[PDB]
Design an enzyme around this catalytic site. Structure first.
Site, mmCIF file in Angstrom:
data_model
loop_
_atom_site.group_PDB
_atom_site.id
_atom_site.type_symbol
_atom_site.label_atom_id
_atom_site.label_comp_id
_atom_site.label_asym_id
_atom_site.label_seq_id
_atom_site.Cartn_x
_atom_site.Cartn_y
_atom_site.Cartn_z
ATOM 1 N N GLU A 166 0.956 -1.202 0.046
ATOM 2 C CA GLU A 166 0.050 -0.099 0.077
ATOM 3 C C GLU A 166 0.760 1.328 0.025
ATOM 4 O O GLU A 166 0.573 2.018 -0.879
ATOM 5 C CB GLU A 166 -0.799 0.011 1.098
ATOM 6 C CG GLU A 166 -1.857 1.198 1.477
ATOM 7 C CD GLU A 166 -1.086 2.177 2.343
ATOM 8 O OE1 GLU A 166 0.028 1.776 3.062
ATOM 9 O OE2 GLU A 166 -1.665 3.422 2.446
ATOM 10 N N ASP A 213 -7.562 1.553 8.408
ATOM 11 C CA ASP A 213 -6.190 2.196 8.670
ATOM 12 C C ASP A 213 -6.083 3.098 9.802
ATOM 13 O O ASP A 213 -7.048 3.789 10.004
ATOM 14 C CB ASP A 213 -5.989 2.749 7.240
ATOM 15 C CG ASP A 213 -4.636 2.739 6.597
ATOM 16 O OD1 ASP A 213 -3.733 3.099 7.504
ATOM 17 O OD2 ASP A 213 -4.589 2.493 5.464
HETATM 18 C C1 LIG Z 1 -3.427 5.353 4.357
HETATM 19 N N1 LIG Z 1 -2.009 5.828 4.862
HETATM 20 C C2 LIG Z 1 -1.521 4.912 5.692
HETATM 21 N N2 LIG Z 1 -0.206 5.266 5.856
HETATM 22 N N3 LIG Z 1 -0.143 6.648 5.263
HETATM 23 C C3 LIG Z 1 -1.230 6.737 4.474
HETATM 24 C C4 LIG Z 1 -1.743 8.131 3.878
HETATM 25 C C5 LIG Z 1 -1.705 7.773 2.513
HETATM 26 C C6 LIG Z 1 -2.232 8.895 1.516
HETATM 27 N N4 LIG Z 1 -1.235 10.186 1.889
HETATM 28 C C7 LIG Z 1 -0.768 11.077 0.911
HETATM 29 N N5 LIG Z 1 -1.650 11.547 0.300
HETATM 30 C C8 LIG Z 1 -1.219 12.444 -0.905
HETATM 31 C C9 LIG Z 1 0.002 12.740 -1.063
HETATM 32 C C10 LIG Z 1 0.871 12.111 -0.118
HETATM 33 C C11 LIG Z 1 0.594 11.298 0.612
HETATM 34 C C12 LIG Z 1 1.635 10.383 1.563
HETATM 35 C C13 LIG Z 1 1.836 9.192 1.807
HETATM 36 C C14 LIG Z 1 2.896 8.637 2.416
HETATM 37 C C15 LIG Z 1 3.728 9.448 3.068
HETATM 38 F F1 LIG Z 1 4.594 9.114 3.677
HETATM 39 N N6 LIG Z 1 3.576 11.109 3.069
HETATM 40 C C16 LIG Z 1 2.620 11.182 2.080
HETATM 41 C C17 LIG Z 1 -1.401 10.339 3.524
HETATM 42 C C18 LIG Z 1 -0.652 9.175 3.939
HETATM 43 CO CO LIG Z 2 1.392 5.041 6.524
#
Ligand SMILES: Cn1cnnc1C1CCN(c2ncccc2-c2ccc(F)nc2)CC1
Ligand SMILES: [Co+2]
Length: 326
Positions: A166, A213
């Protein structure tokens, strides 16, 4: 045939007080902690020793249950930032040839991080706990679930998914993220279901996708994200209240509660995206805000809340029972 529409009309079977009491007494938070949660608090990015063991631990745990669980490994190669990598989604179906499945899911992978001060990211709330709670649900409900082996039922069972990769390797993007989900989704989209049908795919099969999550911080607030699924959110609100009322929770207040009737500002990227964009009803059980310790070395067991996970266990278990009429 209009069975893909059956989900739109499907109703719950509201458990009554003593039923709820019996579910509450049915789930041991500590049985889970020790056996479900603890083994998974290891570095488990894809291809890592952790990955293989995580995957082996999960199947070990399910294989030991009597309900006729059907396990299945979606292993595939895909290009990544760090070069080619083998991914392996863990699917777990009761009654696989049943047209309809309620689907619980999370991610067993963890994000990669360099060993800053001999410390290792184990992604407690993110999402080892989701994994455990699922495996606890699977246990806590074994007897009841075993009945789904046997005229008068809708054609509906339960499925657990544990998506791999993921997490983004480098910069989160369409192509560096949701490796597991993106692939299984596309596979399901094009796999006929039931076998030998016209038109309908395995995705028609997913009544609802319940994606856990980032769960395990105290005082999480979940928003209601999806209108098309807002009625199931309401069931979750109700059940929370109900159990609180019967005093079947530990350390809980209505003012400080989990399922808030407000919406969400942005749009959250997770494993459900590839499913949702194909018109699966999604129920995104991710807290907003994320836990403080999010993507930090602090996302550890020291910082989970025992009571919070337990309470949620109780809520999620009732929800699923009612959904399946069990
Ligand atoms: C669902 N999940 C689990 N662990 N982290 C997440 C989210 C995934 C979606 N995300 C983002 N959305 C848009 C742009 C960048 C990110 C992102 C994802 C991981 C990370 F380390 N930094 C930013 C935020 C963290
Ligand atoms: Co994460």
């Amino acid at each position: 045939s209009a069975w893909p529409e059956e989900k739109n009309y499907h109703q719950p079977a509201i458990l009554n007080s003593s039923a709820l009491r019996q579910i509450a007494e049915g789930t041991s938070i500590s049985e889970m902690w020790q056996n479900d949660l603890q083994p998974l608090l290891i570095e488990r990015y894809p291809g890592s020793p952790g990955s293989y063991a995580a995957r082996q631990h999960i199947m070990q745990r399910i294989q030991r249950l009597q309900a006729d669980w059907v396990l299945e490994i979606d292993t595939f190669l895909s290009q990544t930032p760090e070069g080619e990598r083998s991914f392996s989604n863990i699917i777990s179906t009761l009654n696989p040839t049943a047209k309809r499945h309620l689907v619980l899911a999370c991610h067993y992978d963890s994000k990669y991080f360099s060993h800053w001060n001999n410390r290792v990211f184990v992604g407690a709330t993110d999402s080892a706990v989701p994994c455990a709670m699922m495996l606890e649900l699977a246990r806590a409900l074994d007897k009841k679930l075993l009945s789904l082996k046997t005229d008068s039922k809708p054609d509906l069972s339960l499925q657990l998914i544990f998506f791999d990769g993921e997490e983004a390797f480098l910069h989160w993007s369409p192509q560096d993220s949701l490796y597991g989900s993106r692939h299984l989704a596309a596979k399901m989209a094009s796999t006929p279901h039931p076998p030998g049908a016209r038109g309908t795919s395995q995705l028609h099969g997913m009544d609802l996708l319940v994606l856990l999550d980032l769960i395990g911080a105290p005082n999480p607030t979940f928003p209601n994200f999806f209108p098309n699924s807002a009625r199931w959110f309401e069931r979750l609100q109700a059940i929370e209240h109900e159990l609180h009322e019967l005093g079947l929770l530990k350390d809980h207040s209505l003012e400080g509660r989990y399922f808030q009737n407000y919406s969400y500002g942005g749009v959250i990227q997770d494993d459900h995206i590839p499913f949702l964009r194909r018109g699966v009803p999604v129920l995104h059980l991710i807290p907003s805000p994320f836990p403080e310790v999010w993507h930090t070395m602090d996302d550890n067991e020291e910082n989970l809340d025992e009571s919070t996970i337990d309470n949620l266990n109780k809520i999620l278990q009732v929800f699923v029972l009612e959904y399946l009429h069990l």
